[PDB]
C-alpha cells in the first residue's frame, strides 16, 4: 500500500453526480441531502444488539400529489401508456386524478393500479378553472403534467436514437417497404 | 424453352471465346446500334400496334436481364473487390470506390455482354414486315446478310 | 405497427394476453424484411412459367 | 425460441411471475386474423376451381 499512499497526496476526487442530477431540486417530496456521522464503534458487540446509527427521517408514500406548475419529475420511471396525448374535455371545477405510473386501466385518470404496482409515482390530483379540451399526457414524462408539453416527441426521438430502438423502428419500416415494393413490382 | 435459352447462352459464350472477324464485328455493330436505337433508348409503349409493342417490350426486358443486370453484377463485384482492397489499405471503411468503380465496371462490362448477345436481341425483334419495327429489323437483317454473304432469319 | 397506435399500451397487452412478447415481435420485423426475397423471386419465375 | 432458450432458464434470468389470473378479452379475435386469411384463401381457390 506504500505506492497507493504516496500517490494519494496528488490524487483528486471527483463529484459523484451524473446525468440524473439531484432529485431534491426537482421533487418537492425529496428532502435535501444530509450527512450522518456514525457513532463510535461498539467495544462489545452483543449477539442481540440493535443499530446505534442516527435515525433517518421516514417519508411515507402520499395517496396523491398536487399539480406541479411545470416542475414535475416522477418519483419513479412510469410506464409509457402512449406516445401521443389524449384530447380530453375537462369540466370546470371537477377534480381529476391523472395517472402518473402509466398502467392505469381507466385511461389518463388513476384507476388504482398504482397501489398494486411497485412504484413511487403517485396520482396527480388537480382541478381546472375553465372547462374545455386539454391534451393530457400519456408518456407520463411531461414536465407540465398532467398536461402534455410535447415531451412525447423527444421520447420518440430518444427511442429512435437508441441502438435497439433504431433497429426496431427501421425493421418495421423495411417490413412495410416490403409490401410497398411488392405492390410496385406486382406487374412484371 | 429453358433448353433453348441454355443452348443460346452457351452458343453466345462459345462465340465470344472464339472471337470475331471484320465482317462479324461489322454485323454485330449494326445489330447493336439498331437494338440500342429502337429498344433500349426508346419507350416501347410508343409504337403503334399492340403486338409490336408487346414483342418490343419482351425484347427490351430480355436485353435488360441479359446485359444491364449482368453488367451491374459484374461491375459491383469489381467495385466490391476494389472496396475490400481499399478497406484493407486504409484499415477503415471507404465509400468512394463503390459509385465510381461500379460505374467504371458497368461501362466496361456492358459493351462485352452487348456484343455477346447482340444477335439474340436483333432476332427477337422480327415481329414481321407488316409493322414499322419489323420492317426496320428486316432492312438491317438484309444489310447484315449482304455484309456477311450469308442468309439469316 | 401495433401497440404504438394505442395510447394505453398496458391495456393493449393486458386485453390481448396479459403477456409480453413485444420485444421479440418488434425485433422480428428486421429479419422478416428480407427472409422472403428468394421465395418471392422464385414465385415470380414460377408465375411467369405458368403464364407461358 | 431463442430468447426462451438463452435467458429464461433458472440459471440465467428467471422472472418472478406475480400475475394471478389472465385478463385477455380480445386477443383471440386479434390472433384469428391469420387463420381467417387462411380460410379466405382456401375458400377463394376452392370456389374458383369449382
Amino acid at each position: 500500500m506504500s505506492a497507493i499512499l504516496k500517490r494519494a497526496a496528488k490524487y483528486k476526487r471527483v463529484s459523484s453526480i451524473l446525468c440524473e442530477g439531484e432529485a431534491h431540486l426537482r421533487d418537492p417530496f425529496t428532502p435535501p441531502p444530509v450527512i450522518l456521522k456514525p457513532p463510535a464503534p461498539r467495544k462489545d458487540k452483543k449477539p442481540d444488539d440493535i443499530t446505534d446509527f442516527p435515525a433517518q427521517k421516514l417519508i411515507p408514500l402520499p395517496e396523491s400529489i398536487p399539480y406541479q406548475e411545470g416542475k414535475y419529475r416522477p418519483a419513479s420511471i412510469p410506464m409509457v401508456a402512449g406516445f401521443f396525448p389524449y384530447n380530453c374535455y375537462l369540466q370546470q371545477g371537477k377534480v381529476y386524478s391523472w395517472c402518473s405510473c402509466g398502467i392505469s386501466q381507466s385511461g389518463p385518470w388513476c384507476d388504482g393500479l398504482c397501489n398494486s404496482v411497485v412504484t413511487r409515482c403517485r396520482p396527480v390530483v388537480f382541478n381546472v378553472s375553465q372547462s374545455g379540451y386539454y391534451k393530457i399526457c400519456n408518456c407520463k414524462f411531461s414536465a407540465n403534467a398532467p398536461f402534455c408539453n410535447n415531451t412525447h416527441r423527444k421520447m420518440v426521438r430518444y427511442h429512435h436514437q437508441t441502438h435497439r430502438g433504431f433497429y426496431e423502428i427501421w425493421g418495421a419500416a423495411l417490413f412495410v417497404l416490403g409490401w410497398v415494393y411488392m405492390g410496385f413490382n406486382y406487374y412484371t | 424453352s429453358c433448353t433453348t435459352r441454355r443452348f443460346i447462352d452457351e452458343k453466345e459464350k462459345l462465340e465470344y471465346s472464339r472471337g470475331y472477324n471484320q465482317q462479324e464485328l461489322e454485323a454485330s455493330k449494326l445489330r447493336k446500334d439498331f437494338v440500342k436505337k429502337y429498344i433500349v433508348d426508346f419507350d416501347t409503349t410508343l409504337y403503334k400496334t399492340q403486338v409490336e409493342r408487346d414483342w418490343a417490350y419482351i425484347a427490351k426486358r430480355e436485353y435488360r436481364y441479359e446485359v444491364q443486370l449482368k453488367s451491374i453484377g459484374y461491375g459491383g463485384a469489381l467495385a466490391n473487390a476494389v472496396l475490400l482492397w481499399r478497406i484493407y489499405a486504409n484499415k477503415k471503411m471507404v465509400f468512394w470506390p463503390i459509385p465510381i468503380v461500379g460505374a467504371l465496371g458497368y461501362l466496361y462490362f456492358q459493351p462485352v455482354f452487348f456484343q455477346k448477345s447482340n444477335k439474340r436481341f436483333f432476332d427477337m425483334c422480327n415481329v414481321g414486315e407488316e409493322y414499322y419495327l419489323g420492317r426496320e429489323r428486316n432492312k438491317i437483317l438484309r444489310e447484315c446478310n449482304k455484309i456477311l454473304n450469308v442468309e439469316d432469319f | 405497427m401495433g401497440s404504438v397506435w394505442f395510447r394505453n399500451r398496458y391495456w393493449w397487452y393486458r386485453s390481448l394476453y396479459d403477456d409480453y412478447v413485444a420485444r421479440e415481435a418488434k425485433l422480428a420485423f428486421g429479419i422478416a424484411a428480407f427472409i422472403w426475397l428468394p421465395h418471392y423471386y422464385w414465385g415470380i419465375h414460377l408465375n411467369r412459367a405458368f403464364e407461358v | 425460441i431463442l430468447k426462451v432458450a438463452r435467458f429464461r432458464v433458472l440459471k440465467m434470468r428467471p422472472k418472478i411471475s406475480t400475475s394471478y389470473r389472465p385478463h385477455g378479452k380480445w386477443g383471440d379475435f386479434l390472433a384469428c386474423i391469420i387463420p381467417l386469411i387462411w380460410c379466405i384463401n382456401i375458400l377463394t381457390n376452392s370456389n374458383l376451381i369449382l
Partner: peptide, 20 residues
C-alpha cells in the same frame, strides 16, 4: 385472394402466329 399470388406476369404476351 387480393394479392395472394403476389405478382402477375402481364409482360408474357399471346404467342404470335408465324405461319406462312
Amino acid at each position: 385472394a387480393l394479392f395472394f399470388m403476389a405478382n402477375t406476369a402481364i409482360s408474357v404476351p399471346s404467342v404470335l402466329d408465324t405461319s406462312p
